Symmetry: D2
Subunit: 243 residues, 4 copies
C-alpha cells in the first residue's frame, strides 16, 4: 500500500493473506473472505498455471503478518476460465477452504455489490494489504496491515490517461470494461496487495467494488491502479459460492 | 538462445543488437535488418511507453557483443498502434536508421515472406540472438551470437499446449492468429533474444517467419516460444518500408 | 543460529538485539546484558570505524524481533582500542545505556566468569541469537530467538582444525589466546549472531564464556565458531563496568 | 581501477588475469608474470583454504577480458605460509604454470626490486587491472585493461590516516611494515584488481613494488590502497622461482 496508514485492529475483518511454502509460509497476495468457506482473490495470484494446493495456505485477518499465524489449507482453486493475464482481464479467482471458518466481529465476510452498482467518482473507497509501500520497496517488519483511501476515476478517463506517453492507439482500449480504476500519485495499491479488496461504503454498508489486479508500477503519474470490477463477475461467483 | 551453439561468422548477416544508454551501451533486444535503412523488431522491446530516441542505438552483425561495436543512431521508432502487451499481440516495431547501411558480404538484409507463405508445421527454422542460455541464466562473456534450430508448429497445437496444466478455458484462445510458435524443452529463444529473427529456408531462400515475442519462460514443458507472425503484419511493414 | 531451535520464553533473559536506523530499526548483532546499564558485544559489530550513536538502539529480551519492540538509546560505545579485525582479535565492546534497566523475571543480567575459570573442553554450552539459520540463509519471519547447544573445545584443537585444508603454516597461529571455539557441522552461530553470548552452566550457574566473533562461514567442516574469550578481557570490562 | 584510463596495448606486458571455472572462466584477480613459468599474485586470491587447481586458469596479457582468451593451466599454488588474512599480512602467492610461456615484446616478465629499494613518496608508480571502477561498480564490457598513476605515501602517514575516524588505538599499527600504501580519493585500485602489480620506474627500469592487497573500500577519504611490499618477500620468492 502506497500512502495511507496502518489499519486499526477493528477494521477490514475480511482481509486475508495468501501464503506459499518455501523457507517459510510467505505472503504473496491478498484476498477477501466472502463466505465462511470461500476466499475471493485475483487469478494472477494463483494462475494461469495449475499450482500444487499443498503448497498454499490462507491466513485470516492478522494485524501483523507472520506473528500469530494460524494457517488454513485450501481444498480447491477456481480460476476464471477467461483468465490468462491481467491486462486481458477476468483477473479473478476463488479459494475454497477445507473447513468453514468461525466468524466474529474481528473476522467475518465482506458483502458483494448488487450487479447494478457502478462505483462512480467521489465514492469513499479504501484498499488494504501488506504489499510494497512504494515501487520496489517492501513493507517493513513488523508488517502492519495498511489501508489507504483512494479516489475512483471513471473508466474512459483512466483509459485516456493510460494512453498518455504511450504508442498505443487512442481507440485501442487499455482499461477494459470488466476493470475499475482508482488511485493517484500519493495513494495506490502495489505489488503484494494483488488479490485484495477495494471496498466502498454505500448507504451504510461496506461493499467490495474491486480486486487488486495490476497497473504500471505504483503511484506513477497518469497510471492509476487497476482493479477487477466485481459486478462483472457476480454470476460466476454465485455459481460456486452459496448466498 | 537455449540449447544452441555459437553461430559461424558467415551466417545470419541480418541480425542486429539493440542498445540502451547506461554505464555502457547494453544489449536489451535483437532485431533484423529488412531494408538498408530499416530494422524490424518487437514492440515490447521499445514500448508501450514512449522512450527517448537518443538513449537508443543499433549495432549490426557482430560475432561478440561489445568488442568492436560501431553503434548507429535511430531516427524513428514505429510501434504498432495496437500493441500494449505481447500476450494480446501486435508485438512488432520498426526502427528507421539515420542512414542507409553500406550492405555487404558480412552485413545484409533478410527477405520477408510473401503474404501467402504457409510455413508448414515441422519445417526446420532458425532463431538467433544474444539472450539468456536458460531461465535466468545470462549469455556468458564473450557474448557470442547464438543459433538454434527450432521446429515450427501449428497455432492450434501450440494453443492446446499452453492450455495443458492451465486453468484457462480450452475454448479461450491463448496463442493468437497474429502469432507463430516454435521450440521445445531443449531448443528455444529467451530473454534478450526478443525482437530477433525466426528464419526458415524455403525452397532455398532464407525467409523471416517470426519475431521473438514471448513465452512462459524458456524451454519449459508444453510452453513453446511465441513469435509475432510476420505474414500477418506484411501490409503494415510495407506501409513504411520500401520494396 | 545453525541447527538450533526456538528458545522457550523463560530462557536467555540476558540476550539483547542491536538495531541500526534505516527504513526500519534493523537487527544487525546480538549482545548480552552484564549490568543493568551495560551491554557486552563484539567490536566488529560497531567498529573499527566510528559510527553515529543516534543511529543505534538496543532491544532487550524479545521472543520475536520487531513485534513488540521497546528500543533503548545508547549513551556510549566503548570499543577495545586493540581491535581492528576479528581475526587479529580483541573483538569486544561495551554499550552503555542511557538508563539502567528495571531488571526482572523476563529481563536480567548474565554472570561473567571469574578470571580463573577453566571451561573444560567438551563442556556443553549454549549460544543464542537471531542470525542466519545457515550460510546466506536469513532467519525467517517471525524471527524467533534461537538457541543451540555447542561443545567448547581447546584452542589447540580448534587452531589445528583451521589449518586442515589450509596453506597457513602449521606453526602460524590462527586461533589466538584471546579466542575460544565451539561448534561443529551441525551446530554453530552465524551472521547476525555476532556480539551475542556463549554461556555455560558451571556447577549450576550460567556464566558467559564467549562473545560471538567470527568463523569461516557457519557449520563448515573443520571450521568451528570462534568467540572472543571473556576471561581474557575481564579486567578491561571491569575497568568500566561496576561489580 | 578507480580513475586513470584504458592502458595502451604496448604497456604492462606482465599483467595476468586469474580465472575460476563456473558458467564461464571468470576473472577474479590479477597477477604478474615474473618468470616464464611463474606468476606472482596475492594469497587472498587463492587462499588461505586449499583450492582445486583444475578449476583455475591463468590468462596472459589481453587488451580486453574474455575476447581472445588462451587459458593456461597451473601445476602448483604456493601461498606464503604466514598468510591468513590481508590485514595480518604476508598477502602473497605464486602460481607455477604447467609449461613455460614464450615471451615477446607484448608478453614478458616484470623485474623484481633489489631488497633495498624503499619506493619513497614522489616515485612515479602505476597500478593496473580489470577490477571495479568505483565501490560496487564493475568494469563495463568490453573490459579494457585499466591503469592509473598513483602517489605513494609513507607507511607511518598511511597508518596514521587509517586511525583517523577509528576506535583503534594510535599505537596499534594498522598498516604493517610488509605493506606499502598508495592512492588517493581520485586514484586507486579496487576489487578484482587484487593480486595485480604496482610498478614503479626506477633508473629507467620498471620494477614491481607491490601486489594489490586490501583497503577500506576504494578511493575513500583517509583510506589509501594497501599493497604487499615485494622487497619483504624476495627471499621467499627466490626459494621457488629461478633467477
Ligand atoms: C505467461 S504471460 C507472461 C510470461 C512471462 C515470462 O515468463 N517471461 C517473459 C517472456 C520471456 C521470453 C522472452 C523472449 C522469448 C521467450 C520464449 N521462450 C520468452 C521469458 C520470461 C512474464 C509475464 Si509478466 C507477469 C513478468 O509481465 Si510484465 C512484468 C512485462 C508487466 C506488465 C505491465 S503492463 C503495463 C505492468 C507491469 C508492472 O508495472 N507491475 C506488475 C503489476 C504491479 C502492481 C500490482 C498491484 C497493483 C498495482 C497497481 N498499482 C500494480 C506493479 C508492477 C509489469 C507474463
Ligand atoms: C578494513 S578491513 C576490511 C576491508 C574490507 C573492504 O572494504 N574491502 C575488501 C578489500 C577491497 C579492496 C581490494 C583491492 C584493493 C583495495 C584498495 N582500494 C580494496 C575493497 C572492499 C572488507 C573487510 Si571483510 C569484513 C568484507 O572480510 Si572477509 C568477507 C574477506 C572474511 C574473512 C574471514 S577470515 C576466514 C571469514 C569470513 C566469513 O566467512 N564470514 C564472516 C564471519 C561470519 C560469522 C559471523 C558470526 C559467527 C560465525 C561463526 N560460524 C561466522 C561468517 C561469514 C569473511 C575487511
Amino acid at each position: 500500500i502506497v500512502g495511507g496508514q496502518e489499519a486499526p485492529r477493528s477494521k477490514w475483518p475480511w482481509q486475508v493473506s495468501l501464503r506459499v511454502h518455501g523457507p517459510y509460509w510467505m505472503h504473496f497476495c491478498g484476498g477477501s473472505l466472502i463466505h465462511p468457506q470461500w476466499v475471493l482473490t485475483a487469478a494472477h495470484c494463483v494462475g494461469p498455471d495449475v499450482k500444487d494446493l499443498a503448497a498454499l495456505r490462507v491466513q485470516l485477518r492478522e494485524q501483523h503478518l507472520y506473528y500469530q499465524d494460524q494457517l488454513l489449507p485450501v481444498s480447491r482453486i477456481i480460476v476464471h476460465p477467461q483468465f490468462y493475464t491481467a491486462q486481458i482481464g477476468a483477473d479473478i479467482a476463488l479459494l475454497e477452504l477445507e473447513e468453514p471458518v468461525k466468524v466474529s466481529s474481528h473476522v467475518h465476510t465482506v458483502t458483494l455489490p448488487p450487479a447494478s452498482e457502478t462505483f462512480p467518482p467521489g465514492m469513499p473507497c479504501w484498499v488494504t494489504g501488506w504489499g510494497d509501500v512504494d515501487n520496489d520497496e517492501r513493507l517493513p517488519p513488523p508488517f502492519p496491515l495498511k489501508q489507504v483511501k483512494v479516489p475512483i476515476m471513471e473508466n474512459h478517463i483512466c483509459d485516456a490517461k493510460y494512453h498518455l506517453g504511450a504508442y498505443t492507439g487512442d481507440d485501442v482500449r487499455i482499461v477494459r470494461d470488466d476493470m475499475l480504476c482508482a488511485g493517484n500519485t500519493r495513494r495506490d495499491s502495489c505489488q503484494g496487495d494483488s488479490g485484495g479488496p477495494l471496498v466502498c461504503k454505500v448507504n451504510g454498508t461496506w461493499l467490495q467494488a474491486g480486486v487488486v489486479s495490476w497497473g504500471e508500477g505504483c503511484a506513477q503519474p497518469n497510471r492509476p491502479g487497476i482493479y477487477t470490477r466485481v459486478t462483472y463477475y457476480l454470476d460466476w461467483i454465485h455459481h460456486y459460492v452459496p448466498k
